[PDB]
Amino acid sequence: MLTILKLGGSILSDKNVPYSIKWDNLERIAMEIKNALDYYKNQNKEIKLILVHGGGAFGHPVAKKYLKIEDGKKIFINMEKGFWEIQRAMRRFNNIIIDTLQSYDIPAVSIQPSSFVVFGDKLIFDTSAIKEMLKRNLVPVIHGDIVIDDKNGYRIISGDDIVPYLANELKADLILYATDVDGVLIDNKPIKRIDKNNIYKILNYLSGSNSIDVTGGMKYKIEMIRKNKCRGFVFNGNKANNIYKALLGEVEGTEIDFSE
Amino acid sequence: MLTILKLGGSILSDKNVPYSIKWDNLERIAMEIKNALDYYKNQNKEIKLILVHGGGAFGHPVAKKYLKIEDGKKIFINMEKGFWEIQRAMRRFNNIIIDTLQSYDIPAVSIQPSSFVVFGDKLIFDTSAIKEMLKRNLVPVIHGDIVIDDKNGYRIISGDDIVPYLANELKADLILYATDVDGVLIDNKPIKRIDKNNIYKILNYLSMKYKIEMIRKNKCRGFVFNGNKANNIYKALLGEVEGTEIDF
Ligand SMILES: CC(C)CCOP(=O)(O)OP(=O)(O)S
Numbered sequence A: 001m002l003t004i005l006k007l008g009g010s011i012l013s014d015k016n017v018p019y020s021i022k023w024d025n026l027e028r029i030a031m032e033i034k035n036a037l038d039y040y041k042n043q044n045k046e047i048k049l050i051l052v053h054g055g056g057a058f059g060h061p062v063a064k065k066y067l068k069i070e071d072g073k074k075i076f077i078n079m080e081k082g083f084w085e086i087q088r089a090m091r092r093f094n095n096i097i098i099d100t101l102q103s104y105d106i107p108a109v110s111i112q113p114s115s116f117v118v119f120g121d122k123l124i125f126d127t128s129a130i131k132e133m134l135k136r137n138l139v140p141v142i143h144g145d146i147v148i149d150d151k152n153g154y155r156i157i158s159g160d161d162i163v164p165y166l167a168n169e170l171k172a173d174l175i176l177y178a179t180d181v182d183g184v185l186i187d188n189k190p191i192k193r194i195d196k197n198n199i200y201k202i203l204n205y206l207s208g209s210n211s212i213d214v215t216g217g218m219k220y221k222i223e224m225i226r227k228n229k230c231r232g233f234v235f236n237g238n239k240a241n242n243i244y245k246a247l248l249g250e251v252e253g254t255e256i257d258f259s260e
Numbered sequence B: 001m002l003t004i005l006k007l008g009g010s011i012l013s014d015k016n017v018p019y020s021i022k023w024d025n026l027e028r029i030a031m032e033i034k035n036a037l038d039y040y041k042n043q044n045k046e047i048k049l050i051l052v053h054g055g056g057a058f059g060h061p062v063a064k065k066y067l068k069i070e071d072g073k074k075i076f077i078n079m080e081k082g083f084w085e086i087q088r089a090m091r092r093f094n095n096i097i098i099d100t101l102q103s104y105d106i107p108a109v110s111i112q113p114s115s116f117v118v119f120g121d122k123l124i125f126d127t128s129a130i131k132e133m134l135k136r137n138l139v140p141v142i143h144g145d146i147v148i149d150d151k152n153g154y155r156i157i158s159g160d161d162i163v164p165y166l167a168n169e170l171k172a173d174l175i176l177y178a179t180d181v182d183g184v185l186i187d188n189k190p191i192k193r194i195d196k197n198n199i200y201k202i203l204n205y206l207s208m209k210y211k212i213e214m215i216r217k218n219k220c221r222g223f224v225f226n227g228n229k230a231n232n233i234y235k236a237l238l239g240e241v242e243g244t245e246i247d248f
């Protein structure tokens, strides 16, 4: 069984204080992932786990310096300094996360997309090594990064790109989205279930004016799950034991289900 | 128009001082490379350039903690801690070297092989990203690293692998190995050259082994020279033979 847990800059990092790290929250999060790895070892169930995390206060601020709008558009400039500057900021934040996971004996290792992913209409993103890590029970930790594209330019690959890509590429069963809110909210209240008998109803409600999330972040997540025909949870990752629960298949936020 | 320079971990590091860095040497070297890229800048000649470095004082001491002799054959143990710990060490070393290159305005970036290279049957090493970086005139810096090995579990890929693989995979023109010796030493003396004639006599003697071979299986052409002699790198980069030629 293959689970992908998306953390995200936010709960790990205050994006208004640059290079900032919410040590306490990060530390509890490693506690919980450890607790859950223990649980699965005790109950003899096979689990493969991949973690993904955003740039947080590390990548966005370094990157903003190298972005400009030209003719109403995003373009990266000065990347002879800027590719390394962003890589280096992300490396540091990957180190902090991985050393903390390691200090609870989670066998975390680093995947750095900047070194090998090419961003086009389809990703080039060879997952051979990852499969071999999972096959050895290592825990791959992949992060938002800067990458080149196949059009003379550059792109930020985010957790939002990374996860669907891997869900699909690796046939994941469970997608966990730890976020800053309690679920997909409909009336300031997480909806328990979303499946093939309400999704469109939910997707329209999300495009509307009574929707508490108008960035369309929820929508994209819901859609990737249906698109990969699996299961996923969107939950508040700031709440004690949600990560542990989620990893056991039972946190309480919004479940999204398109498996089978 | 594509050159590849390996920098012996030995000329960047002191192999007996775990964690040491050779700063003057590291700084002198970044400088000559910049002067070199600059020389070509004027000739209005397009030069693409990849750099490789080993584990030096970083890779090895940390690999050591996780290598057991299981009476023949090195054995990796406790890689649930070891894989990270080795990644981390090589990351430190790469960071220091890329920061130094960047201080001379060399557009360096990190290629970390542990993230995606699988050794074992058929070296799996996707160069898409590297070819694109090269189209931008960035300078990829690849380093010896721990990697997955689908047959044996874990292997340590070295610069000696990476460099010939990539020379043949990108078809590089000029191949340079800067090291702490004046060339390939035969009887304490640097052979001017190495054919498929005298090669027969040379493999015999040699039982840097792995280096001379890995480049033959590839019909490459490389130069082995002394990286400590001020200016060798600058000269070598400009295509002036230095030390030992090895032609396949
Ligand atoms: C500037 C970067 C490299 C951002 C990294 O991507 P992300 O979108 O996953 O970051 P987040 O928004 O903190 S979850």
Ligand SMILES: CC(C)CCOP(=O)(O)OP(=O)(O)S
Residues within 6 Å of the ligand: B007, B008, B009, B010, B053, B054, B055, B056, B057, B059, B060, B063, B086, B090, B143, B144, B145, B146, B156, B157, B158, B159, B160
């Ligand atoms: C993690 C490692 C020990 C990589 C060692 O790589 P290498 O053998 O190419 O470098 P060198 O030995 O410094 S010339």
